[PDB]
Symmetry: C3
Subunit: 24 residues, 3 copies
């Protein structure tokens, strides 16, 4: 399913905006 593929990316990139912002 597509629902499961979206869920996997959602988990994968759960805190990357925050972590990049912290590195910055």
């Amino acid at each position: 399913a597509l629902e499961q593929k979206i869920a996997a990316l959602e988990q994968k990139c759960a805190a990357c905006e925050q972590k990049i912002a912290a590195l910055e």
Copy 2:
């Protein structure tokens, strides 16, 4: 449906993800 929206939200969230990581790498 719900799905299209969850996809759009991800597209927006990680819009600049890769370019900022690269800027961080370069600097």
Copy 3:
């Protein structure tokens, strides 16, 4: 749906090494 399939593939490619590069930078 055919587009939704394509858009998901697009994000999987975009952020393929994303978490690994962040971890390394940290």
